[PDB]
């Protein structure tokens, strides 16, 4: 029940929530719980896309972004259980890391 915490930064439209099969178009910035940024689609000036229902992203995103409506900006705090677990992500994220993502849901495709 606490694998991902979603805290609203600015609201969306309150009606359009992503469904399985839909593609979410987002800008994000990921950091360790300490605060050290490890990636951001904003640094590439190009939104990230992922389709729900396909195991395309860590579980904290799959459940976390589905709680967001189009336009919403939110802070997602994801336990290692819902992220990279005991293994981490090769050369990026250590074992048992708590992650924090600033996510803006731009549109659905
Ligand atoms: C210019 C580019 C560099 C090369 N390039 C990629 O190499 C694509 O890399 C990914 C794409 C989609 C999802 C993934 C990783 C997955 C990782 C693989 C995966 C998939 C599913 C899992 O379960 C079912 C899982 O369970 C363990 C693991 O990333 C995630 O889910 C979460 C949530 C979505 C945002 C990224 N995410 C992170 O953590 C991070 O910020 C990373 C990966 C450290 C850094 O991301 C990036 O640079 C972004 C994405 N790269 C790109 O935009 C393209 C273009």
3-state secondary structure 23-64: EEEEEEEEEECCCCEEEEHHHHCCCEEEECCCCCCCHHHHHH
The total domain count for the chain is 1
82 is catalytic: no
Residue of 23, 24, 42, 57 with the most ligand 1 atoms within 8 Å of its CB, for mutation: 57
Q: Report phi then psi at 2, rounded to 5.
A: -115, 15
92 is catalytic: no
Query: Is there a contact between 13 and 106 (Cβ–Cβ < 8 Å)?
Result: no
Query: Sign of torsion, CA 63 68 72 77?
Result: negative
Q: What's the burial of 109, exposed, middle or buried (CB within 10 Å: 0-12/13-18/19+)?
A: exposed
Q: Report phi then psi at 23, rounded to 5.
A: -95, 125
79: tokens are 């336990």
Give the domain extent around 69: 1-109
Q: Is the CB of 53 under 6 A from ligand 1?
A: no
Experimental method, per PDB record:
X-ray
Give Dmax (Cα) for the chain: 39
Mark 38-76 as b/e (b = at least 16 C-beta within 10 Å).
ebebeeeeeebeeebeeeebbbbbbbbbbebbbebbbeb
Q: What's the burial of 4, exposed, middle or buried (CB within 10 Å: 0-12/13-18/19+)?
A: buried
Q: Is the CB of 48 under 6 A from ligand 1?
A: yes
Which of 48, 93, 101, 102 is the catalytic position?
101
Residue 23 and residue 32: Cα distance in Å, rounded?
26
Residue 79 and residue 100: Cα distance in Å, rounded?
9
Residue 103 and residue 47: Cα distance in Å, rounded?
11
The DSSP-derived string for 8-24 is EEE---SS----TTPEE
CATH number at residue 18: 3.10.50.40
In terms of Cα–Cα distance, which of 104, 83, 80, 79 is closest to 8? Answer: 104
């Amino acid at each position: 029940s606490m694998g991902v915490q979603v805290e609203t930064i600015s609201p969306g439209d309150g009606r359009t929530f992503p469904k399985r099969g839909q593609t979410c178009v987002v800008h994000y910035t990921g950091m360790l719980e300490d605060g050290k940024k490890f990636d951001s689609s904003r640094d590439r000036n190009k939104p990230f896309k992922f389709m729900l229902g396909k195991q395309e992203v860590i579980r904290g995103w799959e459940e976390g972004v589905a709680q967001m409506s189009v336009g919403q900006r939110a802070k997602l705090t994801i336990s290692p259980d819902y992220a990279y677990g005991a293994t981490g992500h090769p050369g990026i994220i250590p074992p048992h890391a708590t992650l924090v993502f600033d996510v803006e849901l731009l549109k659905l495709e």
